[PDB]
Amino acid sequence: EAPNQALLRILKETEFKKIKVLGSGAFGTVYKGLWIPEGEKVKIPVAIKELTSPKANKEILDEAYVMASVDNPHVCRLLGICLTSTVQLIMQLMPFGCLLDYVREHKDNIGSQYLLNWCVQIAKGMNYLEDRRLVHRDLAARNVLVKTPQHVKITDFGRAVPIKWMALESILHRIYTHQSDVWSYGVTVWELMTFGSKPYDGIPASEISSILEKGERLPQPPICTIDVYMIMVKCWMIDADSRPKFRELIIEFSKMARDPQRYLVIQGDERMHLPSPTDSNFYREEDMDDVVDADEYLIP
Numbered sequence: 001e002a003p004n005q006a007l008l009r010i011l012k013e014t015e016f017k018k019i020k021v022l023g024s025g026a027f028g029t030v031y032k033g034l035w036i037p038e039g040e041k042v043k044i045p046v047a048i049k050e051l052t053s054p055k056a057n058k059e060i061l062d063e064a065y066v067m068a069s070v071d072n073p074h075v076c077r078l079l080g081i082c083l084t085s086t087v088q089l090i091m092q093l094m095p096f097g098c099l100l101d102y103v104r105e106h107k108d109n110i111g112s113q114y115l116l117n118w119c120v121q122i123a124k125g126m127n128y129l130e131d132r133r134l135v136h137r138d139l140a141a142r143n144v145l146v147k148t149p150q151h152v153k154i155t156d157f158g159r160a161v162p163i164k165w166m167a168l169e170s171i172l173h174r175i176y177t178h179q180s181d182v183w184s185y186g187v188t189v190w191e192l193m194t195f196g197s198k199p200y201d202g203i204p205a206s207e208i209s210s211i212l213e214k215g216e217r218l219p220q221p222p223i224c225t226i227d228v229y230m231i232m233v234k235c236w237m238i239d240a241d242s243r244p245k246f247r248e249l250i251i252e253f254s255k256m257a258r259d260p261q262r263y264l265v266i267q268g269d270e271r272m273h274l275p276s277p278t279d280s281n282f283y284r285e286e287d288m289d290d291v292v293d294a295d296e297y298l299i300p
């Protein structure tokens with residue numbers, strides 16, 4: 001159908017520097033880095049991904065394809081690739097890491113406004129992916145990255161098996177739709193509302209399918225009013241068409257974000273605060289002089 005005219009930027013190894021390791025797992029190793037292009041007088045904070053088998057290079061390049069094809073404020077985009085012996089993905093630096101660890105590490109300062117705004121942002125990212133006919137297949141709080149506590153983006157399109165985040169049709173029939181992503185969105189919201197609790201803790205992955213067929217779902221988080229929990233529950237209907245659309249989720253959560261204390265009950269809310277550009281030394285190693293974020297540099 002429509003031709004994909006996305007630009008794949010090839011970047012020189014010499015144009016960027018690795019500073020430290022941010023994470024190292026199955027995906028390979030992710031580094032904090034700086035990208036100093038040609039003679040543009042700019043330093044772009046970046047995240048460098050690297051895993052030498054010919055089978056592995058094919059997988060890192062299929063991920064680069066999807067990641068270079070997206071452009072949305074709530075979706076992680078590929079900045080470029082470096083054609084070294086291994087092959088490196090140059091991505092935007094999300095200084096605060098993944099949302100799962102962020103809600104766990106900062107629960108005592110996470111208020112209703114932040115939780116509800118993150119829900120809007122994730123729904124907006126997902127609705128963009130829907131408009132682009134792209135089905136995520138791995139939406140979880142671990143795959144939502146934090147640029148600033150007030151700005152989150154969806155990542156990991158290396159699937160565009162996590163049973164405990166999957167819709168019933170995905171588990172039993174391997175059916176993946178935008179509606180099956182809505183189920184995963186529901187679990188992601190549950191993870192946030194519980195400040196990073198593990199869904200179905202203790203229960204093995206094979207029992208999940210049987211549990212779901214019975215009618216059993218994730219419990220109501222203590223901070224959740226029936227209004228927020230009803231939305232999570234609607235994301236887990238057997239009939240996929242009965243589940244909300246991401247555009248409905250944008251609207252529903254944003255109505256709630258206008259009067260957040262009416263929808264989430266948190267002890268200490270109002271006296272809670274998270275880092276923001278208002279903070280003295282919010283952006284803080286050596287040279288922080290001509291530094292600019294990827295969202296402001298070049299622009300597609």
Ligand SMILES: Cc1nc2cnc(Nc3ccnc(NCC(C)(C)S(C)(=O)=O)n3)cc2n1C(C)C
Nearest residue numbers: 022023027030047076091092093094097155156
């Ligand atoms: C601790 C940490 N700090 C980060 C700063 N910036 C990014 N940048 C980006 C940008 C886009 N995608 C990704 N993906 C990283 C990933 C490990 C979640 S994955 C599975 O998608 O490769 N990272 C990733 C970061 N991390 C990872 C390892 C969770």
